[PDB]
Amino acid sequence: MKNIESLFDYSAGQFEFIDHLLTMGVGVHFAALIFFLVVSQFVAPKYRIATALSCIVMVSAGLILNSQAVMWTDAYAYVDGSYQLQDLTFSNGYRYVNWMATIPCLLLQLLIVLNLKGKELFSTATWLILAAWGMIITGYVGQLYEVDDIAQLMIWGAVSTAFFVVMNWIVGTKIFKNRATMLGGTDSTITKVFWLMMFAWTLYPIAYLVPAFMNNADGVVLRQLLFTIADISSKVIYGLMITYIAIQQSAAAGYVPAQQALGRI
């Protein structure tokens, strides 16, 4: 049960573009990691964990993007005018394993800026993480068959989509029922984060389906391109909005370092 990446030889332009996409993603996440670390001091204690979760996400994704980059250059060699598969192996499956950690972190930092606490926070986080883990795990099993069994990729993806929809319903319901509690005008900002999340996370099932409608070397490139757009949107851009909401609410709650931080800009 191979992946479609192992099926093709690659032109130098295709190979280097994919490598440059992954290495670019590493640099963006580690550059954002520094930003999230420095602005941590400008967030009130109640919200500071949300910015720390951005730091964990940046290193988690950055390590897996660097991992994918070197595996790409390990597994292929330029022979007779094209990059051909060598002794080693490349696989998008390590992305799925990493999602088991990064997705709960992304969801947790949203619940924190929604001002959920105590029993409701733990309760809502447990249902969301369980739904997300069911989405990822059924998706992982599905892509094992992206070459061998296209019908199984479809059926496991339908199961995965059911968890995805239920997960989004919980997220959206909590957002619209707790919007009134949010400070500094961030009741307007949080609805924008929900829509950004809808857009960015939907890119992943689209990349999952690439083997069904573009099973060639250019579809390998398009999938990595979609992953890159989705990774930056769902982690970096999303994290900046979460951090903005965290600081804005900190300032409205009387945190002086937050108020000063916004004043200078």
Which stretches of the chain bind ligand CCCCCCCCCC, using CB under 6 A? 23, 26-27, 30-31, 34, 120, 123-124, 127, 165, 168-170, 172-173, 176
103 Cβ partners below 8 Å, 6+ apart? 129, 132, 136
Minimum distance between the CB of residue 255 and ligand CCCCCCCCCC, rounded to whole angstroms? 27
Minimum distance between the CB of residue 108 and Br ion, rounded to whole angstroms? 15
Q: Which does 244 bind (CB under 5 to 8 A by kind): ligand HEX, Br ion, ligand CCCCCCCCCC, none?
A: ligand HEX
Contact 233, 33 (CB under 8 A): no
Q: Provide the terminal-to-terminal Cα distance of the chain, rounded to the nearest Å.
A: 54
- Give yes or no for residue 62 binding ligand RET (CB under 6 A): no
Q: Which does 199 bind (CB under 5 to 8 A by kind): ligand HEX, ligand RET, ligand CCCCCCCCCC, none?
A: none
Residue in this structure with the two tokens 């988690």, named with its chain if needed: 60
The alpha carbon of 57 is separated from its chain's Cα centroid by a whole number of angstroms, namely 8
- x/- site string to ligand RET, residues 226 to 245, per CB under 6 A? -----x--xx----------
Q: Which is nearer to ligand RET, 157 or 211 (CB)?
A: 157
Q: Which is nearer to ligand HEX, 17 or 244 (CB)?
A: 244
- Give yes or no for residue 61 binding Br ion (CB under 5 A): yes
CA–CA separation, 110 vs 27, rounded Å?
A: 24
Minimum distance between the CB of residue 118 and ligand HEX, rounded to whole angstroms? 28
Which stretches of the chain bind ligand HEX, using CB under 6 A? 39, 91, 93-94, 97, 158, 161-162, 165, 237, 240, 243-244, 247, 261
CA–CA separation, 170 vs 107, rounded Å?
A: 11
16 Cβ partners below 8 Å, 6+ apart? none
Burial class (CB in 10 A: 0-12, 13-18, 19+), 211: buried
Q: Which pair of structure tokens corresponds to residue 195?
A: 């829509």
Minimum distance between the CB of residue 222 and Br ion, rounded to whole angstroms? 19
- x/- site string to ligand RET, residues 9 to 38, per CB under 6 A? ------------------------------
Sign of the dihedral through C-alpha 175, 177, 183, 185: positive
CA–CA separation, 126 vs 123, rounded Å?
A: 5
Q: Which is nearer to ligand RET, 157 or 184 (CB)?
A: 157
